[PDB]
Amino acid sequence: TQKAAAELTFF
Residues that bind other proteins (CB under 8 A): 1-11
Length of the chain: 11
Say which residues have a Cβ less than 8 Å from residue 7's Cβ, sequence separation at least 6: none
Shortest Cβ 6–other proteins spacing (Å): 6
Shortest Cβ 5–other proteins spacing (Å): 7
Shortest Cβ 2–other proteins spacing (Å): 4
